Amino acid sequence: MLEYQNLFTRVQVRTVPEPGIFSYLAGKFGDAQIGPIYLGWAGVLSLIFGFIAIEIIGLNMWASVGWDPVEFIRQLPWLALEPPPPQYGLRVPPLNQGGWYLMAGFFLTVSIILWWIRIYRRARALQMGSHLPWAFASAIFLYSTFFFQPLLVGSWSEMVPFGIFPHLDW
Amino acid sequence: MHRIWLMYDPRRVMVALVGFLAVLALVIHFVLLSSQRYSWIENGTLGADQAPVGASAPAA
Amino acid sequence: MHRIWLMYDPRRVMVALVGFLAVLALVIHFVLLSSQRYSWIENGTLGADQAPVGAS
Amino acid sequence: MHRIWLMYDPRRVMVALVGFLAVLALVIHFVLLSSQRYSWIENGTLGADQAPVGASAPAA
Amino acid sequence: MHRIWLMYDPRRVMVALVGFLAVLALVIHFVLLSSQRYSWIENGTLGADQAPVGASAPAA
Amino acid sequence: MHRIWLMYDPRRVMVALVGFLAVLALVIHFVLLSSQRYSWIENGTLGADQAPVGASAPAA
Amino acid sequence: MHRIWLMYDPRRVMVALVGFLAVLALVIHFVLLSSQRYSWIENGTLGADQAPVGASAPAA
Amino acid sequence: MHRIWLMYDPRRVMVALVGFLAVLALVIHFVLLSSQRYSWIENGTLGADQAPVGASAPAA
Amino acid sequence: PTAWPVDPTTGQTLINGRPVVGRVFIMRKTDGTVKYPNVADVVAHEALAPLPPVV
Amino acid sequence: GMTEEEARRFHGYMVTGTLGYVVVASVAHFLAWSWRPWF
Amino acid sequence: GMTEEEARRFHGYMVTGTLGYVVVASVAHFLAWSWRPWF
Amino acid sequence: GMTEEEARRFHGYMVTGTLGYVVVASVAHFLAWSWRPWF
Amino acid sequence: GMTEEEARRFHGYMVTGTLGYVVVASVAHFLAWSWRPWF
Amino acid sequence: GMTEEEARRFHGYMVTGTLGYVVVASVAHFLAWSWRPWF
Amino acid sequence: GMTEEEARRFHGYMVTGTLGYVVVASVAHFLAWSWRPWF
Amino acid sequence: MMEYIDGAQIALYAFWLFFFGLIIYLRREDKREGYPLESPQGPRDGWPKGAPKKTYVHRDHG
Amino acid sequence: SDVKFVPADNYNGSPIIPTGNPMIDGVGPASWAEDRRDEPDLTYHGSHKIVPMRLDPTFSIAKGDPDPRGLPVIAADKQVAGTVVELWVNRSEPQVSYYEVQLASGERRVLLPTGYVQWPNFGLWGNDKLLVKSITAAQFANVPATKRDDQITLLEEDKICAYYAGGHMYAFAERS
Amino acid sequence: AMLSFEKKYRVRGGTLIGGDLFDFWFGPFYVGFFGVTTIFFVTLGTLLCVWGAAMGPTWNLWQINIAPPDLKYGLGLAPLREGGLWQIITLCALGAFGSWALRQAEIARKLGMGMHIPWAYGGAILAYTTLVVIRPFLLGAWGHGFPYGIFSHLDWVSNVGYQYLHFHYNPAHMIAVTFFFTNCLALAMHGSLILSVTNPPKGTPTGTSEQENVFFRDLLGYSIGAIGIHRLGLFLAVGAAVWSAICIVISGPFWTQGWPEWWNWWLNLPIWK
Numbered sequence A: 001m002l003e004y005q006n007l008f009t010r011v012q013v014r015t016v017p018e019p020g021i022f023s024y025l026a027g028k029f030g031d032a033q034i035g036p037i038y039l040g041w042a043g044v045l046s047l048i049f050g051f052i053a054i055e056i057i058g059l060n061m062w063a064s065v066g067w068d069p070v071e072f073i074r075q076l077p078w079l080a081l082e083p084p085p086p087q088y089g090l091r092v093p094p095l096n097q098g099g100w101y102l103m104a105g106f107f108l109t110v111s112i113i114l115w116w117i118r119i120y121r122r123a124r125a126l127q128m129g130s131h132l133p134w135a136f137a138s139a140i141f142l143y144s145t146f147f148f149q150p151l152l153v154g155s156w157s158e159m160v161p162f163g164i165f166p167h168l169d170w
Numbered sequence B, D, E, F, G, H: 001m002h003r004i005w006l007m008y009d010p011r012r013v014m015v016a017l018v019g020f021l022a023v024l025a026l027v028i029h030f031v032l033l034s035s036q037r038y039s040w041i042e043n044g045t046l047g048a049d050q051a052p053v054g055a056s057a058p059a060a
Numbered sequence C: 001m002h003r004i005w006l007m008y009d010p011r012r013v014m015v016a017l018v019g020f021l022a023v024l025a026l027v028i029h030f031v032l033l034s035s036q037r038y039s040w041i042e043n044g045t046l047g048a049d050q051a052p053v054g055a056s
Numbered sequence I: 001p002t003a004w005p006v007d008p009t010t011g012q013t014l015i016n017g018r019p020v021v022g023r024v025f026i027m028r029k030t031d032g033t034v035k036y037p038n039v040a041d042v043v044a045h046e047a048l049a050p051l052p053p054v055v
Numbered sequence J, K, L, M, N, O: 001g002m003t004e005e006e007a008r009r010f011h012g013y014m015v016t017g018t019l020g021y022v023v024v025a026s027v028a029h030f031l032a033w034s035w036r037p038w039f
Numbered sequence P: 001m002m003e004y005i006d007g008a009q010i011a012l013y014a015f016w017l018f019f020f021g022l023i024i025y026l027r028r029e030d031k032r033e034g035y036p037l038e039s040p041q042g043p044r045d046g047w048p049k050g051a052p053k054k055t056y057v058h059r060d061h062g
Numbered sequence Q: 001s002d003v004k005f006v007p008a009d010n011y012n013g014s015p016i017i018p019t020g021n022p023m024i025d026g027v028g029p030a031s032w033a034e035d036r037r038d039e040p041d042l043t044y045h046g047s048h049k050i051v052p053m054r055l056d057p058t059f060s061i062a063k064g065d066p067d068p069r070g071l072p073v074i075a076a077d078k079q080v081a082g083t084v085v086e087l088w089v090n091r092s093e094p095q096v097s098y099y100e101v102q103l104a105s106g107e108r109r110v111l112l113p114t115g116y117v118q119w120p121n122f123g124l125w126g127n128d129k130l131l132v133k134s135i136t137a138a139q140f141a142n143v144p145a146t147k148r149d150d151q152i153t154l155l156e157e158d159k160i161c162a163y164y165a166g167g168h169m170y171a172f173a174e175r176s
Numbered sequence R: 001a002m003l004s005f006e007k008k009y010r011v012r013g014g015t016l017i018g019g020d021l022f023d024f025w026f027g028p029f030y031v032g033f034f035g036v037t038t039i040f041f042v043t044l045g046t047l048l049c050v051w052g053a054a055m056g057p058t059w060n061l062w063q064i065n066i067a068p069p070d071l072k073y074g075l076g077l078a079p080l081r082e083g084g085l086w087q088i089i090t091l092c093a094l095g096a097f098g099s100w101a102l103r104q105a106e107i108a109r110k111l112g113m114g115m116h117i118p119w120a121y122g123g124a125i126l127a128y129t130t131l132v133v134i135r136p137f138l139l140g141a142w143g144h145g146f147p148y149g150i151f152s153h154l155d156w157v158s159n160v161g162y163q164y165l166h167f168h169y170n171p172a173h174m175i176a177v178t179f180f181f182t183n184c185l186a187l188a189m190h191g192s193l194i195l196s197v198t199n200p201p202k203g204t205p206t207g208t209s210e211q212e213n214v215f216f217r218d219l220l221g222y223s224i225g226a227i228g229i230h231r232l233g234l235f236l237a238v239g240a241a242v243w244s245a246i247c248i249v250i251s252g253p254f255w256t257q258g259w260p261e262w263w264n265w266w267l268n269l270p271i272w273k
Ligand SMILES: CCCCCCCCCCCCCC(=O)OC[C@H](COP(=O)(O)OCC(O)COP(=O)(O)OC[C@@H](COC(=O)CCCCCCCCCCCCC)OC(=O)CCCCCCCCCCCCC)OC(=O)CCCCCCCCCCCCC
Pocket: P020, P021, P023, P024, P027, P044, P045, P046, P047, P048, R001, R002, R026, R027, R028
């Protein structure tokens, strides 16, 4: 859309070599590598744990429409991976009755924590204050109450289902 | 008196006047069209003694 | 008296007066139009003995 | 007393006064028009022996 | 005691004072008007023997 | 004791004190006017024996 | 022990202390006013043996 | 042990300590006040054999 | 209990034994609304508590 | 900026147009009154 | 700004226009009162 | 800024307009009182 | 800033106005008490 | 800020105003008490 | 910032003020206890 | 055994005391620029008093 | 009296009135931060952040954009104020920060912050001239100077931007 | 009182109405003509809210409730004690909110700023006007407005939601929620990044646009740039209110069934009907 400053209306510019003394540097601000999107050990581990979490959620949704790929797309916002039955309380439930749910919840939670480590390490390496990691920690605090409140009332059945419309039903 | 048009730009006044009258006319027509007595699209062919009248005062 | 117009530009006051009076007139009409006694569009043909009174 | 007009600019004290009187007059009229005794648009034609008077419940 | 006006600009004190008194007066009138006993717009014509009184403690 | 006024600017302290005492006074009045015993606008004419009193311990 | 006033500015501490004591007092008064036993505005005229007591262990 | 006051600014540690102790004291007082056995504002005058006790094991 | 006495001579309402000029109405707040006293009073207007589940 | 003679001729049209508008509205009201009077 | 003789000229118009408006409004109330008195 | 002479001149109108406004309000209150007393 | 002479002049007005207002409010309470006492 | 003579002078008024306020409040409490005791 | 002898002087007021306050609170608890003991 | 006082109410006033402490802190930070205020009868600090104006240490490149 | 402005009257909260030309003196929306540090801004590695493009061959116009150099600049009074001789770029966040304008019918060259330029048809088509809506072609002669032509200080940035900012109020006014 | 750099900026000019008459300050506040009209509407509308509380059942701040009229009054003014007072306060509120935006335009003009702030606030005014003017007008009664009361308007929100059985399924509402949530994330990121370069760990040089650019690119995988993050915040925040206004105006005037059954069109696409 049109804009009330010339700055990138027209005559945008190309640094054909890199900026940082479009293009990007390959170097360091101190010890922090500047080229690729940063991961480190925690970023790599976070992607593995988070991938398996998302993969478990998707495969349970797809199994719930009987592996039908047409219904998998057609019904996608109604599909869910669902918490255990209430009678189990905090005990380990059957695999098809919430056992996959708690597994995906565990792998997702570890993946989130490892992503916080990544951001914390990167802020230190770029020689920045820790304001962003503590901001992200406040979001993780709310997320964690979807584990702790079910724990405090004594049943995993009270957890949020993984699913677009189902989590809004919850 | 014509010197009033030195106080205000007539080009501006006429635009304000037409706007005011256009909005006012639409408001009055909408008020009447929404009434019972003057809902003339549905009931305009009724004679004056057949047209609705609002309620009177109670007898006592 | 006239020195009031040395403080307030009469060109501007006269516009603000028209704006004030137009809104005030509209408010008073819409109040009356919505009352029982003065709902003249529905009941204006009633005689003053027939017109509603808000007794209860 | 006139020296108050040296403390404050009379041009804008008068705006504040006229604005105060407008708000106060409108508030008092709306307060009365809300009341039962002084809802004068509906009941203004009643004589004082017919005008509403509020009381508490007779508390038997 | 007049040296209080060396400490505070009187032009600011009058503004604070008028602001305070206007709010306080309006608070008290609306509080009274919200009461039963002093709802004077509805009940002002009642005599002091007739005006409401809030409930006692239980009679025994 | 008076050297407190060298530690703090009296013009700032007096404004703060006035603000505190105004808010505190309004709080206490609103607390009392919220009560049953001291709802004085409705019940201030009641004698001390007639005024409400909170429940005692139930006698065994 | 007085060297604490080298470590902290006393004119900040004295205001911080006044703030602390103000909040602490208001908390304790409002907690007590919320109780049954010590809601003194309603029940303050009760004698000590008449004042409410929380339930004992039920004897059985 | 005193090297702790070189490792960290005592002004920071003092505020951190007082903050910790105040928060801990408040947590414990309200936890007790919320309990049955130690709700001292309502039941503080009960003797120790009259104070509540939690449920024992079944069947001895 | 629902209305003050009326003087048979004049149809005129008597409050605490003395006439009022005008038509007396019993004052109420907006639409007769009344502040809820407490949870127990709210609950006393409701149905009783639900029965225990059948498991 | 309008001159006083431009204002002089302009006002004549403004009066004429206002009078014409009031005339048409006056007939419109008298027709409406004959069809369904409001008092 | 405006000269005191322009202010004295305008004051003549403003007083006359204000009072003429009040006169027209007073007649409108006379008609409304004759039709349906509010006291 | 206005002189203390202009202040006295302005204050004379301000008192007079206040009095006139209070007079009108007083008659309006006594009309209202005679129609429907509030005490 | 303000002269002590000017502060003393203003104080004369400020005290007088304050006490005048309290006197008018005293009469208002006298009337209200005679109409409907609150104790 | 203030000289110590100004601080001394101010403190005399401050204590006198505080005493006057406390006196009025003391009378207000004794009026309240004799009307409706809270213990 | 304060000299050590300023800190010395302030500390004397500060300790005296704290102890005087605790004394007034002690009388308040004496009165409160005699009216309605909490143990 | 307190009827009226409950854990949610306790938590809420704990938050209010924190929150008003935060607003005081934020208003001190708002005053690091453009304060003390100018007026007739001299400088004005508002309330709370502002934190001091803040110097920033540049990175060296020599 | 060199003082740039005087009160409109003695009451509290009254406006000030400029004594001289407000665009030159820097009053109201023409004013600038007068205590601002008179040094160049620096990149992370400490080079000058804003420089003429001829001093850093890393930078070039994105292919298929117009190069604005050599275009005429059309001022608020539709007069041709000059022609673009050079671009100045921000090296920390690659963009054009200023046009440099060779003044028509004058000796001098002046900077022009790109926030105050617009293209005809907002750049979509045409692009044969530049429009500066905020000041007249006469006022272009008084645009503040930089002490050097290879660098600009933070104070000089503030002065130049404040000049074009004031124009929308003062360009068509006798207050000069 | 004035900021230590302020006096220089307090010129005349930039007013949209009234010339020099109202062009002055009252303490920190600029007045102007729409300052005067703001205070008029604020005072009248507030005092009528106080009157609404006085004639209502209680003074408790949370419980005060100035309700709109019954639907049977349609587009007329009800009796004041029966919702007419809510209508007058609504006219005051519209007058106040409009005056406030136009006063902001005078302030921005006087400082040589763009008009962005008045237009951004226009997005809030649009949502309000939709709730109390446009949707009630399309439904044919002012009684469809929400009551003025701190918790009683939340009862209205609750009941309007359940008028459509499961309001989460409203498609425009899902978009509006996504803008509100993404806005809060973006605000946390932008706030954190600026603070973390300007307040580094002790004994570390003040950071640079390059460091925040690098960190932002590590977070989102692309560089938004300094102008872009403020454009994005404004787009998200204002877009949230615009999509809010859409989601409520479609509920009732246009869609009247439950919101879950709106999604029937997706289930019936011919590729998979
Ligand atoms: C719930 C989650 C979200 C909730 C979200 C909540 C967000 C809250 C944002 C608003 C807070 C900031 C407001 C502010 O600072 O205004 C400036 C003003 C004056 O200080 P200054 O600006 O530094 O100095 C100027 C002044 O000294 C001299 O100026 P001048 O001579 O030209 O003009 C005259 C003076 C007179 O003072 C006043 O008229 C203001 C008095 C009322 C202030 C109330 C502030 C709000 C308190 C809210 C906290 C709580 C109060 C109970 O100055 C002025 O004219 C200044 C006019 C400022 C008008 C601001 C109005 C803001 C209204 C906010 C309403 C919020 C409603 C929610 O400041 C103050 O008066 C003190 C305010 C301090 C912050 C409140 C902290 C409360 C902590 C707890 C109690 C502390 C007890 C000691």
